[PDB]
């Protein structure tokens, strides 16, 4: 499933 990068993106990513 989600690797560590996908999890970090799910936690913090914000569209700008």
């Amino acid at each position, epitope marked *: 499933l989600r690797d*560590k990068k996908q*999890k*970090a*993106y799910a*936690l*913090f990513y*914000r569209p*700008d």
Partner: antibody
Amino acid sequence: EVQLVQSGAEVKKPGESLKISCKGFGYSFSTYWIAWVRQMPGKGLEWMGMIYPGDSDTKYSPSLQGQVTISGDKSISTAYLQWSSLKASDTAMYYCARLLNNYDSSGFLYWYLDLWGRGTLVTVSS
Amino acid sequence: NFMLTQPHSVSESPGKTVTISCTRSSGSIASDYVQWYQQRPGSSPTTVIYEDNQRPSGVPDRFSGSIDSSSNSASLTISGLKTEDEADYYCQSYDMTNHNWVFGGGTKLTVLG
């Protein structure tokens, strides 16, 4: 140049409200998460929550049970940690930290706490 | 939901290497990123390791991070121990069910003088 300035120490009593601040200088405050870390005297770090000020999107620790509020005012680039009713247990140092995000050699983003305030010491004694 | 257990204390003489280990109670230590923070006396914490093994600019390479999935642990290794490294070290990871940050209890590193 970039800095986080936290409000000075507070010595209050049980039942008093409180609101401590964390202002960012030298960068776009609204585009980075601000996290709050509690450290009771002589003990370890505890994560209490996060706020993205751009949209004031908030995350909390499961163990706060509504006692505290995490807010922001991006017109003045400030984050806030707020107690409606203080308790003796709330005695601790409270740091705010910026979650930096850059690009790594792979082209993906990474996050970590690069910038810390000096911490607000909150004593709550009768 | 998980815990991160850390030894209370470790010590070593200057110049040699120390390792601080951080065991996760449940789930794989390799399923979520691991950060390590340093906190000297009377100072605010700083990140010495992030994303298991990445070092922020200004942190020397004598600090290194690793993951052992067999033991379900993360490790911080400090080579060429200097007296300025005496401090509390904390491991930290994420719980995705609630997006919570889990911290270890902290380990006091003393440089034997």
